[PDB]
Amino acid sequence: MTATLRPYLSAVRATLQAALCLENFSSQVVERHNKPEVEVRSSKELLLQPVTISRNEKEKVLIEGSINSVRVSIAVKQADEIEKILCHKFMRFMMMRAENFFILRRKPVEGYDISFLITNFHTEQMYKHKLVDFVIHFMEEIDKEISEMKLSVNARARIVAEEFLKNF
């Protein structure tokens, strides 16, 4: 198994234990309507560090955090058009279904390959750490699914003469 993934995502979840921070405040100088706080960050001392975290040499994460709301973005080794544009027939397909799950910073963001918008609301909405114990790892499983589409698509390459010529 890719076992330094264990150091990797155990340290992700140690960061997401050091800093399960996100809790609310509204206003003290400007309006009560809690914002995309990670976008609208004015100043440092109130808030989490801006950060980036390589897995190797192409692969890395960005995380950035207001004390109440957060970005993630994640980068992948793959770089062929046959890796990218083909899975981007899906990453097109993906984004309306982001509207059916509400926490994407809804784009396949470059330098990385994706991004996320995360907030304190969720901490009050249903549950506790089973949440991040799902999320952080589900995020690998949806990568292992690329292997699922891989043999699928490669077998669509195995559609080819298997129709046209095999008619005869």
Partner: protein
């Protein structure tokens, strides 16, 4: 850290890493897919149960090991099993680590392109080369020179080596495997009067056989004995609470290696057929070869066969020279471990095609106008 070494072949899969003492990634090199209306529809099952899970479910499944023009032909069904390796055995990418692949003698033309098409466009390895499996055995023995038998579940071959220089006309590849045995063997159940005899019981047949079979010591003595005895007959549980007690078949059908002629097949019997390697070989060496007779496979773990085949071979042979016949404990299991340990001679890598060579022309850098 690693470079990738496998029994990618027939029987079970028997893979590990470079340099290990043992293959470990191990389950049948065959897989099943539901033969059924899934009447509890939506019960959350994927379309296959694989080797050990195939067996856990074998009453459910359709399964494949294609035409005897090869071992298989839609190798793109090990398609699935490539992932079943990469994740379901391992959770790793081949694309990470230098890979030791393997293939047999005399594969018909298209093999190595059609292979490497996958192995680099798909398995994307840093760099690789492909071995032939015979001398892997001698590596474990710490040897180079003698006659090497394979008989297996894919195939058979019979392989003279001399620190290399192995004989293109006296190495003897053959389609034969334990694969084949059962077609005669299982017709006997109507002699047994069993109104109940199928495809899926072939694995139990093979079981009982792997538990209790042996090759007859001097077969008409055995036939006269079966005609006069039933201590032969030995008991065996069956899955509802039954037993069957059976056991003359247990060495009767184990004559067919000398008698392919049983199906009316015009092939000579085993050692006689094999001798022709030596007959085509150099003649001088045939003294010294008495000490160099190396024998192995899962198919090789039976009782009685050893002394039989020796005396059988001896019916072909002169006396005159000092024998050693050479067949180790675990010879069945062993071959992957010798081939695993080769990679320690890091020299073995330098042959490697990298993905660049494969990219640039194509695997037209190495395929089969190449020798």
């Amino acid at each position: 850290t690693t470079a990738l070494v496998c029994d990618n072949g027939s029987g079970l899969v028997k893979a590990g890493f470079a340099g290990d003492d043992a293959p470990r990634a191990v389950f049948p090199s065959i897989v099943g897919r539901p033969r059924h209306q899934g009447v509890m529809v939506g019960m959350g099952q994927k379309d296959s149960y694989v080797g050990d899970e195939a067996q856990s479910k074998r009453g459910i499944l359709t399964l494949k090991y294609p035409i005897e023009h090869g071992i298989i032909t839609n190798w793109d069904d090990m398609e699935k099993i490539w992932h079943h390796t990469f994740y379901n055995e391992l959770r790793v990418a081949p694309e990470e680590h230098p890979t030791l692949l393997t293939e047999a003698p005399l594969n018909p033309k298209a093999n190595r392109e059609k292979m490497t098409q996958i192995m680099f466009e798909t398995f994307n390895v840093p760099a690789m080369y492909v071995a032939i499996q015979a001398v892997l055995s001698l590596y474990a023995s710490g040897r180079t020179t003698g006659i090497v038998l394979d008989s297996g579940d894919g195939v058979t071959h019979n392989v003279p080596i001399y620190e290399g220089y192995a004989l293109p006309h006296a190495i003897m590849r053959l389609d034969l495997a334990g694969r084949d045995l059962t077609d005669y063997l299982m017709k006997i159940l109507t002699e047994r009067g069993y109104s109940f005899v199928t495809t899926a019981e072939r694995e139990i047949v093979r079981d009982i056989k792997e538990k209790l079979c042996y090759v007859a010591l001097d077969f008409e003595n055995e036939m006269a004995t079966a005609a006069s005895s039933s201590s032969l007959e030995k008991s065996y549980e069956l899955p509802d609470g039954q037993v069957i007690t059976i056991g003359n078949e247990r060495f009767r059908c184990p004559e067919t290696l000398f008698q392919p002629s049983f199906i009316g097949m015009e092939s000579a019997g085993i050692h006689e057929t094999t001798y022709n390697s030596i007959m085509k070989c150099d003649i001088d060496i045939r003294k010294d070869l008495y000490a160099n007779n190396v024998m192995s496979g899962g198919t090789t773990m039976y009782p009685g066969i050893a002394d039989r085949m020796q005396k059988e071979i001896t019916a072909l042979a002169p006396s005159t020279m000092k024998i050693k016949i050479i067949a180790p404990p675990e010879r069945k299991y062993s071959v992957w471990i010798g081939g695993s340990i080769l990679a320690s001679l890091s020299t073995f890598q330098q042959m490697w095609i990298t993905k660049q060579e494969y990219d640039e022309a194509g695997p037209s850098i190495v395929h089969r106008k190449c020798f």
